[PDB]
Design a protein around this ligand. Sequence first.
Ligand SMILES: CC(=O)N[C@@H]1[C@@H](O)[C@H](O[C@@H]2O[C@H](CO)[C@H](O)[C@H](O)[C@H]2O)[C@@H](CO)O[C@H]1O
Ligand SMILES: CC(=O)N[C@@H]1[C@@H](O)[C@H](O[C@@H]2O[C@H](CO)[C@H](O)[C@H](O)[C@H]2O)[C@@H](CO)O[C@H]1O
Ligand SMILES: O=c1ccn([C@@H]2O[C@H](COP(=O)(O)OP(=O)(O)O)[C@@H](O)[C@H]2O)c(=O)[nH]1
Ligand SMILES: O=c1ccn([C@@H]2O[C@H](COP(=O)(O)OP(=O)(O)O)[C@@H](O)[C@H]2O)c(=O)[nH]1
Ligand SMILES: [Mn+2]
Ligand SMILES: [Mn+2]
Lengths: 288, 288
Amino acid sequence: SKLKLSDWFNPFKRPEVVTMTKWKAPVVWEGTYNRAVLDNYYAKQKITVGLTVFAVGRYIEHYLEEFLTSANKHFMVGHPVIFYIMVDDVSRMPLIELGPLRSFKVFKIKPEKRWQDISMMRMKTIGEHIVAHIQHEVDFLFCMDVDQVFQDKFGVETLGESVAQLQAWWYKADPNDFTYERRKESAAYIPFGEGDFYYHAAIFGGTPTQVLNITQECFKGILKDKKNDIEAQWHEESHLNKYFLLNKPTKILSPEYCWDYHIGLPADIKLVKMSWQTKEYNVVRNNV
Amino acid sequence: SKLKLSDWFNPFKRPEVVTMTKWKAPVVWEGTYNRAVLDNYYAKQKITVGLTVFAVGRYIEHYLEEFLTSANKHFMVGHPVIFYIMVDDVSRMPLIELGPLRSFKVFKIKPEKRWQDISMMRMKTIGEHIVAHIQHEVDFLFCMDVDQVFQDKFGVETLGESVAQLQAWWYKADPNDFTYERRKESAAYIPFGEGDFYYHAAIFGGTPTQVLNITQECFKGILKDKKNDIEAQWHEESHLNKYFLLNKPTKILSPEYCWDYHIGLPADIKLVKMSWQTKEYNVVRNNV
Ligand SMILES: CC(=O)N[C@@H]1[C@@H](O)[C@H](O[C@@H]2O[C@H](CO)[C@H](O)[C@H](O)[C@H]2O)[C@@H](CO)O[C@H]1O
Ligand SMILES: CC(=O)N[C@@H]1[C@@H](O)[C@H](O[C@@H]2O[C@H](CO)[C@H](O)[C@H](O)[C@H]2O)[C@@H](CO)O[C@H]1O
Ligand SMILES: O=c1ccn([C@@H]2O[C@H](COP(=O)(O)OP(=O)(O)O)[C@@H](O)[C@H]2O)c(=O)[nH]1
Ligand SMILES: O=c1ccn([C@@H]2O[C@H](COP(=O)(O)OP(=O)(O)O)[C@@H](O)[C@H]2O)c(=O)[nH]1
Ligand SMILES: [Mn+2]
Ligand SMILES: [Mn+2]
């Protein structure tokens, strides 16, 4: 029969951290997952996993290659994977060598004038690509920032209907300290006294159906704000958090899946699967 | 289960041409296949189809783009396809936009000094790639020349264990007129009095297992001839023909699947799926 949470998830292996949400969704931490059981189950379902990534402007030279090279080596090893790359200058797209079960597909996109819109417009573009082709090509999809690098296996244990990432700096913080959009005028507004976690927009996924809804609702909020002459504090991330507050994710990833070494390396982070690239806004951004 | 030939192949539709061999293999002509029945069959088995193509030197600028643009449009439509592109200079590789169910993988290869060796080395390289990864990615694979363009649907009706292509200029000729290698000193030698058809090396395919044997055996003959100071009249094509004589293909494609318009367009050619590019050796080749 079907896959059951206990088949692959054992929360008691990590008693010192949050492994379950009040809506019964698991928070995946190193040690709680049985990847062997899942690689088997999914192999028999012959699944294919997609991964979208954008690189506009200097983000191409600065991060695209490192991102893809690491993704090839660590993302969903043992299963067919398709990398969907969106850049503004395809002549700069690095055609590095891919390994077994990896393939790519590159798309030329318009570069928005403000880096903020470059970051936010991703929600619209992803939705279009899901409708146009991704829904027909994969069973699950992850959408990620390019300014990060895979450090270890990021596999099937991360798959789910809708998947969210716990932002590294706030996983232990109280919701009322979260950097949610606090202005009622914004569609991303979340009042004090509300919120479960602070999700990182650098990583999110799920089935194409769920990701389409996530990206569609987020872009609708982004456009609504533009009509009301307001822009969320943390752009599409603020909208993503509003979305995940209303539509609880079926799976959350621990900070081990998107860690910022600037924090150092505390006891809770047992095995880092991905790490943030140091910020270099002075050079990679050309406005604000 | 159990796909039977009559399920999709009806020879009586083309009574004026050879539609069946003496060893039970069908010769696919326009009108004889039921692609609808096959598409449904293969869709249920969730097959993926691979296509390899080499472009070394000026063949890249002259033919790679056109080849890929046409393949994207007509090759195995409705099914997952992976294009494996082998070039010697990835920077000149045209990265065209691909449509639904199409994805790429590019590899940098060494350019052999003689065009004859570039053409023949393909047999070795394909074999290496099948073992390293293609055998784990596709159910069927086609290996094609780059100096041609898809003109119409080239689909599932072409799939089989081992697939051979009839050369457009000799499909009606007698075996003794075929341009086989007639020197007994060559591993590709075929005596007068023998032979079924003259196969084109511009197109051949089958399951990864079969293509691995086709390629490995041809290359062995190629290396042997080098040890005996002889080079087949039509290079790897001569060896391919010797191979298909000993190991009969389970399916053959009519000239409609690889036609040369310089012959003109006779009544037998009902619907062209692929056409030869005009030869331009003076520019694309650097040695006699
Ligand atoms: C505690 C604290 O203030 N920590 C900040 C981090 O939050 C910050 O990361 C940024 O966080 C915002 C959300 O608040 C968003 O996720 C950004 O994309 C992310 O980069 C970090 C940045 O260097 O500095 C810490 O001091
Ligand atoms: C009748 C005749 O000689 N026709 C030739 C074609 O055969 C020839 O095509 C070449 O054929 C050889 C095998 O004989 C091999 O397949 C080559 O790759 C192929 O290009 C054609 C070439 O322009 O000229 C005709 O006159
Ligand atoms: O000028 C830009 C701005 C953004 N991005 C994309 O948008 C993501 C989010 O922006 P950024 O990473 O800079 O935000 P941060 O995490 O730093 O907050 C990046 O990873 C890129 O993929 C880009 O390519 N070029
Ligand atoms: O210098 C060369 C010679 C050959 N090829 C490859 O080998 C195939 C066979 O060579 P060619 O087409 O020129 O042979 P022909 O059909 O003309 O006889 C080509 O389509 C290319 O894919 C190449 O890329 N560069
Ligand atoms: Mn980022
Ligand atoms: Mn050719």
